[PDB]
């Protein structure tokens with residue numbers, strides 16, 4: 001039954017100095033329809049589209065979303081790429097051209113065989129106010145705030161059905 | 177042929193004030209064996225274990241990793257949960273107890289059918305130096321920096337086989 005705190009921490013090395021400037025920059029998800037996905041992440045969740053890359057040979061596009069003030073995005077192309085790819089906590093959406101037109105195609109959300117990735121998670125000031133608004137907007141839920149044993153935590157789904165955790169960090173010390 | 181720049185932006189909404197303090201707090205991956213995972217993410221990648229939660233009735237644990245200075249971790253348990261779950265860009269590792277003693281179980285990395293999730297990525301000052309060190313330490317690679325078309329970009333594998341991009345933001349314009 002799992003590692004104790006002490007045992008887990010025994011498994012943790014200090015950071016080599018060579019890694020001291022490393023940052024966790026992106027999480028990449030493939031999206032069926034980038035129009036729907038852009039609309040959800042910006043209008044529903046209040047992210048900003050900070051960069052778009054197209055690769056006509058490989059027939060895909062990349063869309064980088066972040067919680068960033070659009071007024072901070074550099075105007076010049078090279079500058080813009082360097083800035084967006086050095087932001088922490090970006091969402092990279094990959095659009096393989098032609099999926100949005102293919103009724104037989106969908107992506108897998110990791111939460112059923114074969115499992116792996118589970119979710120991204122958004123910290124909000126208030127899970128119940130955020131979720132009321134998501135409800136007014138027609139968002140699909142996996143788990144409402146008062147559903148289940150883990151009250152005060154929610155899961156919604158994006159247009160591909162990827163799961164997104166809605167957590168309030170300042171309430172969460174009544175859970176462990 | 178994928179979206180135009182104009183058509184992409186046209187599907188973007190400004191951020192509703194209800195989202196003004198939202199942040200992208202976590203990516204969750206499921207891990208077969210936390211002992212290997214914690215060693216990798218801390219010793220190899222230089223992350224810090226900032227919080228561990230255990231759920232003995234549901235038989236799992238959560239491990240929160242992040243690029244944070246271990247001297248910023250609050251000393252007190254409840255403040256620590258609130259600080260840790262309000263950090264941007266955490267990796268959340270879920271260990272369902274028992275997987276690590278099951279030769280018939282393995283997690284899927286999302287890069288073979290059925291695809292969805294693709295990878296996380298770490299921005300680094302120096303892709304080649306980082307990956308020389310990874311090689312020294314026995315790390316498994318999907319793509320060495322000089323392999324294939326996209327020179328100067330790498331993908332490594334974690335203990336469960338999740339792909340991790342290794343990029344230098346300031347070469348990603350140049351490397352044309």
Ligand SMILES: COc1c(/C=C/C(=O)c2ccc(O)cc2)ccc(O)c1O
Nearest residue numbers: 028030060092094096294297341343348
């Ligand atoms: C996906 O991450 C990247 C890529 C690379 C993207 C791909 O090669 C890709 C194409 C189709 C697919 O199904 C999955 C991946 C290229 C540059 C870059 O900065 C970056 O972050």
Ligand SMILES: COc1c(/C=C\C(=O)c2ccc(O)cc2)ccc(O)c1O
Nearest residue numbers: 111118119121165167202204238268270
């Ligand atoms: C959702 O991840 C959490 C959880 C709880 C749940 C999971 O991580 C999860 C595990 C297995 C699965 O198949 C789906 C989801 C509980 C508290 C918390 O802060 C947090 O981030």
Ligand SMILES: [Zn+2]
Nearest residue numbers: 028092297341
């Ligand atoms: Zn990427």
Ligand SMILES: [Zn+2]
Nearest residue numbers: 121165204268
């Ligand atoms: Zn989570």
